């Protein structure tokens, strides 16, 4: 028997990531061969990263730390277009290294909510050793890590628990938003991505608008939408790893100016969940299946996506 899933949710909340970690974890995987098919994703990300960060330390106003790296910076663009093809000197990997160790590359780096920067740029660049070596084959993790804005609709099967899943993904950012009614028919649940750590963050889209505040806006629509009265709404609050780290140290008054709680992930990791979940209009008879997840940890997605799938048996597929 069938189960249609849906996965909504603003961009670069972690819908795709979410479609690979069924693979991984129903799947057996990536391939070599198909992992190898990820690896120009994997230097385009680098590269874009540093680029970024570059960047904006020219609209910041931010030197280097040490001069030397601005010839580092003028072979970065001389090198750049390997990367973008698949390849990664050793060359080209000392001067990214370089730029990514200096001190003011690290100021701007740290500043990175005045602009937009991937979120997997620390990952890949603190992994240049690894990403540069010969015969470099991307990892799992590197795949799940690799950021591609979904511009169509992507439709995945896999098979659980003795089910047939048929998983939809499309993208969530303003231009694409017209293309999610494509996909409303026959919807056993919606999971609604909302990255957690978007809430300092700006839209790509338009930097006039609060990330957090255009999920909850989107949220607001889908949940209370009487076209899904019975389609199950599962809530992911995903990058929970971003979001402990980013609590410590910026403030979720930039998103909710009346929040009285502490810096700290548990009451404001609940005051976020708290502020979706009043949006639903019928709290009496609509229930919201909320978990806390971390899209690229295969674990924590195999656990969470167990308890979800367990849910959505028992309420979606008896047999009459
Ligand atoms: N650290 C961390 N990174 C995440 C998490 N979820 C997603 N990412 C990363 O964020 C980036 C965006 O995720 P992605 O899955 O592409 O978003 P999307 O919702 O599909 O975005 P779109 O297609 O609507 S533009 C990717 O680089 C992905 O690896 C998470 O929970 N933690
Ligand atoms: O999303 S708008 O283009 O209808
Ligand atoms: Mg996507």
Redesign the pocket.
């Known amino acids: 028997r069938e189960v249609k899933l849906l996965?909504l949710?603003?961009?670069?909340?972690?819908?795709?990531?979410?479609v690979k970690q069924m693979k991984i974890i129903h799947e057996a995987g990536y391939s070599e061969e198909e992992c190898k098919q990820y690896k120009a994703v994997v230097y385009s990300?680098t590269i874009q990263s540093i680029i970024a960060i570059i960047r904006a330390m020219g609209r910041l106003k931010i030197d280097f730390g040490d001069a030397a790296r601005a010839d580092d910076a003028r072979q970065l663009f001389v090198l750049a277009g390997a990367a973008e093809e698949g390849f990664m000197t050793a060359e080209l990997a000392g001067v990214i290294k370089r730029l990514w160790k200096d001190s003011g590359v690290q100021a701007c780096f740290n500043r990175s909510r005045e602009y937009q920067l991937?979120?997997?740029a620390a990952?890949y660049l603190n992994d240049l050793d690894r990403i540069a070596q010969p015969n470099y084959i991307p990892t799992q993790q590197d795949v799940?890590?690799?950021?591609?804005?979904?511009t169509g609709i992507v439709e995945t099967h896999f098979t659980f628990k003795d089910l047939h899943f048929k998983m939809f993904?499309?993208?969530?950012?303003r231009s694409?938003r017209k293309k999610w009614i494509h996909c409303f028919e026959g919807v056993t649940a919606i999971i609604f991505?909302v990255?957690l750590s978007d809430y300092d963050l700006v839209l790509a889209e338009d930097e006039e608008m609060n990330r957090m505040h255009e999920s909850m806006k989107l949220f607001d629509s889908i949940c209370n939408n009487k076209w899904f009265t019975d389609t199950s709404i599962i809530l992911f609050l995903?990058?929970?790893?971003?979001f402990e780290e980013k609590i410590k140290k910026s403030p979720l008054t930039i998103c909710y100016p009346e929040y009285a709680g502490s810096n700290t992930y548990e009451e404001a990791a609940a005051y976020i969940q708290c502020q979706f979940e009043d949006l639903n209009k019928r709290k009496d008879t609509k229930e919201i299946y909320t978990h806390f997840?971390?899209?690229?940890?295969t674990k924590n997605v195999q656990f969470v996506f167990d308890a979800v799938t367990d849910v959505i048996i028992l309420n979606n597929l008896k047999d009459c």
């Open positions: 996965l949710g603003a961009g670069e909340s972690g819908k795709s990531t979410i990300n991937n979120d997997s990952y799940l890590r690799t950021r591609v804005k979904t993904d499309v993208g969530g950012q694409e991505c990255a995903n990058k929970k790893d971003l997840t971390c899209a690229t940890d």
